[PDB]
Amino acid sequence: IEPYYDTLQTILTYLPYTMLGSDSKIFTFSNNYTRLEIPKDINNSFSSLLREVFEFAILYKQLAIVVDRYKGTLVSAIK
Amino acid sequence: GGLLLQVIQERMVYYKGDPTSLDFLTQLFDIVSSDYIGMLNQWLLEGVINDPFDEFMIREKRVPDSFMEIFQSKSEYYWNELFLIKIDGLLNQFQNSTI
Numbered sequence: 556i557e558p559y560y561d562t563l564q565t566i567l568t569y570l571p572y573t574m575l576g577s578d579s580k581i582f583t584f585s586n587n588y589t590r591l592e593i594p595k596d597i598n599n600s601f602s603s604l605l606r607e608v609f610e611f612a613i614l615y616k617q618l619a620i621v622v623d624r625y626k627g628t629l630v631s632a633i634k
Numbered sequence: 635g636g637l638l639l640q641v642i643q644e645r646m647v648y649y650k651g652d653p654t655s656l657d658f659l660t661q662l663f664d665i666v667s668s669d670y671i672g673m674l675n676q677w678l679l680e681g682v683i684n685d686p687f688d689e690f691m692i693r694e695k696r697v698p699d700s701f702m703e704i705f706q707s708k709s710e711y712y713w714n715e716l717f718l719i720k721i722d723g724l725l726n727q728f729q730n731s732t733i
Binding site: 627628629630631632633634 | 647648649650651
């Protein structure tokens with residue numbers, strides 16, 4: 556199928572850095588880490604699958620932002 | 635000087651709900667304060683001030699040599715004026731007139 560199917564193992568090379576909520580050479584965050592742009596040269600199927608995988612990355616990034624922001628600011632003991 | 639205890643206590647308010655951070659801050663406060671407790675214990679058990687850094691709150695002051703003969707006669711002013719309480723270094727526990 557290789558000759559008849561074109562798409563960018565290379566994804567798995569740069570995927571761990573994106574999963575940990577960090578910028579990547581092929582995946583870039585924007586708008587205060589609220590959306591992630593899937594590049595060109597990722598055909599329909601792979602993009603549709605990644606949209607499910609990238610849910611973890613964005614959610615974890617949001618949680619990390621919250622933890623880093625409210626680490627020692629809140630006064631209430633419960634929070 | 636003695637302002638460190640105030641900084642730790644101020645710092646400890648934000649981490650009052652965090653178990654590990656509160657444990658570390660409490661341990662640090664306990665070990666750091668031990669010298670101050672030593673001074674207070676000696677003062678209340680033997681009536682002697684020891685550490686010459688002027689850290690302790692109960693400030694006993696030396697009479698000048700020029701007035702030694704005067705203060706020996708009027709010992710009332712020696713025993714009523716040359717012992718003071720340094721208000722800057724007091725914790726909130728001692729922030730009470732009767733204590």
